[PDB]
Amino acid sequence: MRECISIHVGQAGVQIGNACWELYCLEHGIQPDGQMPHHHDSFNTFFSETGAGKHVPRAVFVDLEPTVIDEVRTGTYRQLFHPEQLITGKEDAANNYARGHYTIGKEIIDLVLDRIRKLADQCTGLQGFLVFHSFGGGTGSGFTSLLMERLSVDYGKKSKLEFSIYPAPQVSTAVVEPYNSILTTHTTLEHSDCAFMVDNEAIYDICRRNLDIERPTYTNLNRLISQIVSSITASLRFDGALNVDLTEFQTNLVPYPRIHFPLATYAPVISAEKAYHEQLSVAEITNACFEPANQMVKCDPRHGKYMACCLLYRGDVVPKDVNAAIATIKTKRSIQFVDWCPTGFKVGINYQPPTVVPGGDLAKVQRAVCMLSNTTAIAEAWARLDHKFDLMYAKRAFVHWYVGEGMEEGEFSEAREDMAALEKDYEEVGVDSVE
Amino acid sequence: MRECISIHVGQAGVQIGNACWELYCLEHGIQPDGQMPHHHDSFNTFFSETGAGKHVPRAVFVDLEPTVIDEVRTGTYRQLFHPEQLITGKEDAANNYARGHYTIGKEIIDLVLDRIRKLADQCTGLQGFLVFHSFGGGTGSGFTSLLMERLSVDYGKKSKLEFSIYPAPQVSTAVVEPYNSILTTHTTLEHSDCAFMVDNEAIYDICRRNLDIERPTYTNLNRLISQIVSSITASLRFDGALNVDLTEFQTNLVPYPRIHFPLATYAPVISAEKAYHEQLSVAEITNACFEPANQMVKCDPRHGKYMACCLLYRGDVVPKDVNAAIATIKTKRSIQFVDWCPTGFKVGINYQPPTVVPGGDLAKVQRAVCMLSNTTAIAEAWARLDHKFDLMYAKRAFVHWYVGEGMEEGEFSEAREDMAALEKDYEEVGVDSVE
Amino acid sequence: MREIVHIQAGQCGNQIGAKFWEVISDEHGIDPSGNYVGDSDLQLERISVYYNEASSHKYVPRAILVDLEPGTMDSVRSGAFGHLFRPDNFIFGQSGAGNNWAKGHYTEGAELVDSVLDVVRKECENCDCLQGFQLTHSLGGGTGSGMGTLLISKVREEYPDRIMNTFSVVPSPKVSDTVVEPYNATLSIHQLVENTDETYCIDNEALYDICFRTLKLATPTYGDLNHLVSATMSGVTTSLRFPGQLNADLRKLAVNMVPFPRLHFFMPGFAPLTARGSQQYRALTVPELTQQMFDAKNMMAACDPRHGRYLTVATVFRGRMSMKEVDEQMLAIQSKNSSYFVEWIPNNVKVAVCDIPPRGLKMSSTFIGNSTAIQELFKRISEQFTAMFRRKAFLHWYTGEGMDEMEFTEAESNMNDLVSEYQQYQDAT
Amino acid sequence: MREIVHIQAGQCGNQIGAKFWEVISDEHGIDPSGNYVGDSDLQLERISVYYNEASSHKYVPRAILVDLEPGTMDSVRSGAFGHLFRPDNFIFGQSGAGNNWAKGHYTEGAELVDSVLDVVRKECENCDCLQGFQLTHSLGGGTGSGMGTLLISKVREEYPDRIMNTFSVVPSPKVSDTVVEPYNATLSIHQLVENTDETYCIDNEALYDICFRTLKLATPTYGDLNHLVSATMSGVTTSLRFPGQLNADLRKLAVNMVPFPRLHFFMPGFAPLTARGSQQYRALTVPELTQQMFDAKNMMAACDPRHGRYLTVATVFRGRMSMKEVDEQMLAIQSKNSSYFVEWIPNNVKVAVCDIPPRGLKMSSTFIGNSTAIQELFKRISEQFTAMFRRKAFLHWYTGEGMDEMEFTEAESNMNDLVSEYQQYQDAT
Ligand SMILES: Nc1nc2c(ncn2[C@@H]2O[C@H](COP(=O)(O)OP(=O)(O)OP(=O)(O)O)[C@@H](O)[C@H]2O)c(=O)[nH]1
Ligand SMILES: Nc1nc2c(ncn2[C@@H]2O[C@H](COP(=O)(O)OP(=O)(O)OP(=O)(O)O)[C@@H](O)[C@H]2O)c(=O)[nH]1
Ligand SMILES: Nc1nc2c(ncn2[C@@H]2O[C@H](COP(=O)(O)OP(=O)(O)O)[C@@H](O)[C@H]2O)c(=O)[nH]1
Ligand SMILES: Nc1nc2c(ncn2[C@@H]2O[C@H](COP(=O)(O)OP(=O)(O)O)[C@@H](O)[C@H]2O)c(=O)[nH]1
Ligand SMILES: [Mg+2]
Ligand SMILES: [Mg+2]
């Protein structure tokens, strides 16, 4: 009776959703066709139920290119989703923000909002929104900005959580990533309650070093992000000794209206062969979470300060050990919070252990911990994007596409001003107080 | 709850460790895969335990050439070690100190220290360090010097014990042994709490004469040194009528900060066929320990004075007999301690007899004794090395490799000065006092 | 007679209440179904004080379970010893406080407080002679803090004569389970020092320490901590739920322990606390209990009493014992710790003795110390609040629900005034 | 009444204590579980002096076991007659003294001495009328020496009126089980002559000699030596743990044997000592015991009494005997050895008689001689210390823990002064 819908925009969102809903259907013992042969209700929060034993997800898969959605319709998860939700456009934004926010997406935004409204009104205790969207793709940035503005107009005060794919510092598949990123950030900065920074480069690094797989496909990154999402929602979806709802997330991890970009982290991530040879202490996994090499965003936390942290544990966990481990973490100097926030933790414990997906890469563990940490190091990352933007704007490169697709240069200048203001705010907060 | 980690540097260290951990796994009834089908806990001091019946050693096998470590990973002791510890470099120091201390080892010293810190923080009553390293090899000397400096910086006041392989007077497999030896000694002279001199030549002699094997492999020398190490640690790892901890070793056998080079000795060492025909009196085995032909360093004790001795017995031993035997030893003239130390013994008794490794060479005995003796004869040995160095430095032979690999000639001159100072200190202590 | 009404706000309050009712039912010999299967009539001679005898000879606890999220409510409902609460009692909302106090006291709470007060009124009219209210809540969680303060204010409006008990789980000094807990603590304390008769401060840190050292448990689950707090509450009420050579009631404790209207914050303590093995190797005598109860290592509030003075102390024993022995022990302990008590309150030890052990044991004891050491606690929190207010961090969440800064200014000033009063009376002469 | 508290420091102290409690339990008929299964009420008439009657009718020794390494502690715990010590007593550290005195008295000991003193204080307040303390420790091992001296200093600070007993295992003259034992011995003796009432010097050499020659044992395990020392201690305390025609207490021995504040070092002795076969071929009469107790070959301290004079002598008998016989024997032995006693102390034999044999015999006897011969011992050690200090050998280990040379200078001067006093009184006239 605490419902929460999922909205997947763009190819990244759709594939991540494939992984996430595979994970869920595995968790609650749900067959791909919605049937099912500590649990409570549990699945009601994400699965609505029809008359028969068939459950359907509360997901809205929207895209402008029918390729990936068609793959979904043809995949093993064909019987599952409500066929009306799988909204497909005709011509994708083609990595162009203007197309994804002014020209094309403007013609199916209404249908998407209609399906959203139907799903919302069929629910009673709606908690909030989960937008799964990338940052570089045109559909992702543009359509997500449009959709967030529309929802914020419609649903005045409700939780709105995003899982952006922050553009990596050195590996970029697109060429216009700075433009899409800056525009979508300038838009979503006033509507998204709490984003969730994740990058592909860091996940490549983690897969190579920790899991000992040298050649990972997007399937593996998707599985990892799905595990993170499942750990986020395990509080709603299960009985825990200290539960937490998404409103608690936005209250705890967001000190100021604008600074709401916490980065994700998960532990333990160890291969099946290395599953033994370590007992996986909860203090050990806490240390793993705080290890700068385990974060899922290519930013060294040591260059900034953790303004807030939220650690969600699951499995056979005992609160005293968590208290001891967090005390130890607070003792060390290399992990230096801001002076003005003396209490830098929210703790949540769940009774259900993480479940390993068959054919997966990780090993069956009894304890797991997902850290959502809002720090100041991420600020430097913005600088990089800013820098890129400046160069690609100093020559007015690629500007003609956006200009001719329903946008003006003054908008680019304004978004640059907004990003500069955000960087200024991060720097100002990073300093210490007097007296 | 008195933990002690082992650090094996270089090929010599790694093979000696193979032998040592084979011996341990045999002692505590530990299968090669860490399972186990007067004892207490006992194994906790060297074996950490995971959730299952699988125990893992607290060892850190580090090398710059992956050959021997790969042999370990492929050997029967594959399942045992924690795979993260088996740190392998890419290009070995190639019997060059500069490579092993400035160029190559400088790039994995951090990973080694990280694993050390993890293993230490997982322990509670950490006693100290066991470095198993040779003296001639480049990796051994250079990497050990670097690692000892780093650990002494990190762990301020803790036990640091080394098992060096002193370069023999006449059998030298390397050609640059004097350089590596002098450099590593000048470095480790300020950090190692207590070294442990052992040589290959003396062990060859002992294997030929006492054990009656004319063609021994390195396996046999390794087994003997492993037996010595096991006798050293039997106090920690077992219940004894008079136990002794490593801090007691460094307190008893080290009169001055610099003179901390005691040589090892073990008894009885008799073949299976000669196991009978002698009842192996504890006084007899004490005499065997003090016999100049049984020491494991090619130095005649009669040319110097025993500044201190530490005899560790194990098996069916009775203290009165030990007292009587030591009294007799003190009575004789050819064993002449320094005047200024009238009490030249530390005695330790353990209840557990030594265990013979199947497929070994020694015979099942009921009593055993390991002597660690700090004397003055070893001083002459330094002279020999000094002499060699002088010649190989009078022509500036081989100097170009070290010069071009991150070192200066003034360093060679300084190390020579330091060795001269150590020899001077040994000579000064060897004299008698007036009034 | 003297029936007591139980209110449970916030998740912690509800879990503590579940364990508490388990303990009480074990005391009176009540089956999980709610019917009496006991063996001693004295169980039923006062069964009415906490229970109501429903028809067909059943018993229902006088509980009023409140929350804003149905999760923990349903957990209680499904679990055993949940099937006897009267199902109409489970008041819960849908929005959830979101760990915010503004939601828990202004926006969300204003929609359920009416139904809660209505069920409260029904239960009050049901009782013969109401004795008082005991509220079990947190101080960090939004629901607990906000809604409990609102309920307390409303009840005190409608019953200015009854007596008020609160078991507020104070935030621990070292760890911080939440991030905005200074704000919730300050606002809740403002309301409490406004309109409460007594407040039983508890920290999870002290309970961790006790379960670790004294009980020799390396795996303290929340069940055990709640079990300890439940034992404390049962010990507090047994003075009236049971006969005794020197009986006590809640009003007696309120009169004895509260010299001034504001200074009514108590730290509890329990004894004996023996591990599973270390029990038969110790004698269970009144001197042993008495000496156990006076030390920092057995105070359920994380603050050394030695840093201040005991303003007053109450001590409730159980099981058969000799009064002279207790008197002698109290005399000795008041003599040797002369610097630990306030000069101007002679004979500052209130004593009560029951006749029934808390099950399984020979004799137990409960300590309720009103000291000046607790000022440190407030000091700590105050400072934290100040810091998090100097930058106005997290301020927007609370501002967006109608509350404004002047609320925080007044609350902080009030808490500082309270600390000043504690300091003044600590060094009075 | 007159309860005694037992402290065990160092590995030797702990092993001796294990054997000692085995002996005592055998005396009073105490099962390994700690419950009394004896047959004679006199066992329980004074059972309180060493035991505490824990509830459910059990008995726990008044022991306080101290160490810095959990090894021997766990060995005691696992072995039989370990399951009755009160488990909260086993205080132990992790670093271990490392056979260093600086660690055992300045660095490591400063972290556990507080807990030790706290348990000491608890036991003291538990007792009715404290009689005194007996400390069982070594003089070579770092833990024993350092921590025992620290505990003695602290206790004497907190109880300047009680009486203090120490059973210090002095280093043997011929062998040296450790290398730095002169330093530990000198520092420990400095502290002891500062703040102890009596010190029972023992050498392992003399015990070896006794087990070899007198008992005709070629295989003396440490169990046997500890058994002998335990029998001596039991004989010392039986004068008050049991009725007697002429009873004695620890204070009586202290007054009789300690003519001057500093000169309070005693060599013990036991009798009879008969091999397994050579027993039935000898008569067990008081003259036989008395003549046995006066010879170098039966003194548990390695120093011939003939080299000096007996300043005083105490003698505690057991079992049923005739007082006139004892008096006659003491008269004869004081007559014929006239040159062996000091001139200016007439009638220098303190006598006590118990009524119970030490289990398995008809009559036994314990000798406690305060002589001047022991000066040789100190002489020896002093010289050794001087040598090892002239070169400042091993000095860095002790310097690195805050101690400096002037400590050693003062301690050596103090020991030389003590030896000078012994020499002066030996040749007094
Ligand atoms: N983590 C993860 N990221 C993905 C995956 N597939 C695509 N991406 C991200 O998608 C980005 C490409 O832009 P998209 O958002 O996919 O563009 P789109 O969704 O196809 O929409 P258009 O821009 O209109 O084409 C890349 O930067 C990738 O990081 C995936 O399987 N896992
Ligand atoms: N006792 C013993 N010594 C060995 C054994 N194997 C090699 N050594 C010693 O190793 C020395 C050779 O130098 P090493 O220390 O092995 O050099 P390394 O370990 O291969 O490292 P690099 O110098 O970089 O090649 C020889 O002097 C041998 O004495 C062994 O099995 N037993
Ligand atoms: N003693 C105890 N305290 C608890 C327990 N569960 C939660 N808490 C405390 O309750 C606080 C959380 O308040 P909660 O009721 O869960 O949040 P709310 O829904 O906003 O009221 C935390 O500070 C915890 O310290 C428990 O089982 N025992
Ligand atoms: N009589 C006796 N003496 C012992 C025994 N064990 C050890 N010792 C003596 O105790 C000394 C060692 O002290 P120890 O307590 O083991 O070292 P520590 O841990 O530093 O205190 C040695 O000089 C031994 O002579 C024993 O069983 N009996
Ligand atoms: Mg696309
Ligand atoms: Mg090599």
Side-chain angles (χ1 to χ4, degrees), chain B residues 10-12 63-65 67-68 92-95 137-140:
Chain B
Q11 173 187 8
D63 185 3
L64 304 186
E65 39 182 339
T67 34
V68 48
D92 51 0
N95 315 342
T139 282

Side-chain angles (χ1 to χ4, degrees), chain C residues 10-12 15-16 69 97 99 138 141-144 169 177 204 222 226:
Chain C
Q11 170 183 19
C12 99
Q15 288 184 321
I16 291 181
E69 49 166 355
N99 209 5
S138 328
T143 291
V169 174
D177 195 87
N204 292 310
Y222 268 123
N226 304 332

Side-chain angles (χ1 to χ4, degrees), chain B residues 1-2 40 124-125 127 157 239-243 245 247 250-257 308-309 318-321 323 326-327 330 339-347 351 428-429 431-435, chain D residues 11 15 69-72 74-75 78 94-100 103 172 174-182 205 208 212 217-222 384 387-388 390-398 400-401:
Chain B
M1 52 230 63
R2 292 153 296 176
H40 308 261
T124 157
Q127 292 282 164
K157 289 193 167 183
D239 188 9
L242 173 47
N243 297 309
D245 297 359
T247 313
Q250 64 184 157
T251 308
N252 290 257
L253 300 187
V254 186
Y256 297 81
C309 305
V318 173
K320 178 197 179 309
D321 345 5
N323 181 11
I326 297 180
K330 298 185 104 303
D339 61 73
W340 45 269
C341 176
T343 67
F345 292 93
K346 171 142 200 64
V347 187
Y351 279 98
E428 160 187 339
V429 156
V431 319
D432 298 326
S433 304
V434 203
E435 305 174 7
Chain D
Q11 171 183 19
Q15 288 184 321
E69 49 166 355
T72 161
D74 175 64
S75 70
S78 303
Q94 303 290 351
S95 296
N99 209 5
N100 186 335
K103 280 195 171 185
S172 161
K174 293 162 51 185
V175 79
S176 59
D177 195 87
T178 109
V179 190
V180 291
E181 72 183 4
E205 210 76 5
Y208 285 152
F212 160 74
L217 261 182
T219 316
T221 171
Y222 268 123
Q384 293 188 2
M388 289 172 61
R390 190 174 305 165
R391 306 288 280 269
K392 292 145 303 179
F394 300 86
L395 185 52
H396 74 268
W397 294 114
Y398 296 101
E401 300 294 339

Side-chain angles (χ1 to χ4, degrees), chain A residues 1-2 40-41 124-125 127 157 193 239-245 247-248 250-257 307-309 318-323 326-327 330 339-347 349 351 428-435, chain C residues 11 15 69-72 74-75 78 92 94-100 103 172 174-182 204-205 208-209 211-212 217-222 383-385 387-398 400-401:
Chain A
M1 52 230 63
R2 292 153 296 176
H40 308 261
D41 192 302
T124 157
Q127 292 282 164
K157 288 193 167 183
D193 300 317
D239 188 9
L242 173 47
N243 297 309
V244 44
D245 297 359
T247 313
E248 319 216 17
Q250 64 184 157
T251 308
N252 290 257
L253 300 187
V254 186
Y256 297 81
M307 286 182 309
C309 305
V318 173
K320 178 197 179 309
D321 345 5
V322 179
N323 181 11
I326 297 180
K330 298 185 104 303
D339 61 74
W340 45 269
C341 176
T343 67
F345 292 93
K346 171 142 200 64
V347 187
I349 291 89
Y351 279 98
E428 160 187 339
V429 156
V431 319
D432 299 326
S433 304
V434 203
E435 305 174 7
Chain C
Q11 170 183 19
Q15 288 184 321
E69 49 166 355
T72 161
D74 175 64
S75 70
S78 303
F92 48 71
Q94 303 290 351
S95 296
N99 209 5
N100 186 335
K103 280 195 171 185
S172 161
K174 293 162 51 185
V175 79
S176 59
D177 195 87
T178 109
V179 190
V180 291
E181 72 183 4
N204 292 310
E205 210 76 5
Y208 285 152
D209 204 335
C211 295
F212 160 74
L217 261 182
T219 316
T221 171
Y222 268 123
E383 179 186 352
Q384 293 188 2
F385 183 94
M388 289 172 61
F389 183 82
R390 190 174 305 165
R391 306 288 280 269
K392 292 145 303 179
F394 300 86
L395 185 52
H396 74 268
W397 294 114
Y398 296 102
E401 300 294 339

Side-chain angles (χ1 to χ4, degrees), chain C residues 193-401:
Chain C
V193 311
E194 276 308 319
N195 302 329
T196 46
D197 286 337
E198 63 190 42
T199 303
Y200 291 49
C201 302
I202 293 189
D203 313 326
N204 292 310
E205 210 76 5
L207 257 59
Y208 285 152
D209 204 335
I210 290 179
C211 295
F212 160 74
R213 166 204 296 100
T214 304
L215 272 198
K216 295 301 181 57
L217 261 182
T219 316
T221 171
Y222 268 123
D224 298 317
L225 292 80
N226 304 332
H227 201 299
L228 262 45
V229 187
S230 67
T232 291
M233 302 167 47
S234 135
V236 174
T237 74
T238 180
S239 77
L240 105 165
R241 307 181 293 99
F242 274 96
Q245 301 176 6
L246 173 48
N247 297 270
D249 102 308
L250 309 191
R251 188 68 69 96
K252 294 174 86 175
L253 308 180
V255 176
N256 290 251
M257 297 288 98
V258 186
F260 304 84
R262 300 166 56 91
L263 285 70
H264 58 286
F265 292 89
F266 311 155
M267 54 174 64
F270 182 50
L273 287 177
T274 65
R276 291 305 318 275
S278 168
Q279 46 184 332
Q280 44 191 14
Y281 299 147
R282 198 203 289 193
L284 295 188
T285 69
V286 192
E288 186 273 342
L289 281 67
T290 315
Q291 71 205 12
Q292 174 173 177
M293 288 186 310
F294 286 80
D295 50 60
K297 64 135 63 182
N298 198 7
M299 294 283 89
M300 290 188 169
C303 30
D304 184 15
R306 309 175 187 88
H307 299 145
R309 298 176 167 278
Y310 291 96
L311 220 47
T312 60
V313 154
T315 310
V316 185
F317 292 90
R318 305 191 51 170
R320 287 172 181 171
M321 66 184 51
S322 301
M323 295 297 307
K324 168 255 186 64
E325 199 168 24
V326 181
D327 302 318
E328 180 185 21
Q329 295 309 305
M330 297 312 175
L331 172 59
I333 210 65
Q334 201 160 1
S335 62
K336 75 172 54 177
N337 298 122
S338 58
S339 177
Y340 285 169
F341 292 80
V342 146
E343 194 84 355
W344 41 270
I345 299 289
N347 290 267
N348 47 16
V349 181
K350 171 60 185 56
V351 180
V353 175
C354 166
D355 300 336
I356 305 303
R359 296 286 293 172
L361 302 93
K362 289 186 175 182
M363 54 183 59
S364 72
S365 160
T366 299
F367 169 93
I368 304 289
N370 171 23
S371 157
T372 48
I374 53 96
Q375 73 155 21
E376 288 179 351
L377 166 68
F378 297 161
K379 287 165 53 184
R380 192 185 77 252
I381 285 188
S382 178
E383 179 186 352
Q384 293 188 2
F385 183 94
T386 289
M388 289 172 61
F389 183 82
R390 190 174 305 165
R391 306 288 280 269
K392 292 145 303 179
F394 300 86
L395 185 52
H396 74 268
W397 294 114
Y398 296 102
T399 306
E401 300 294 339

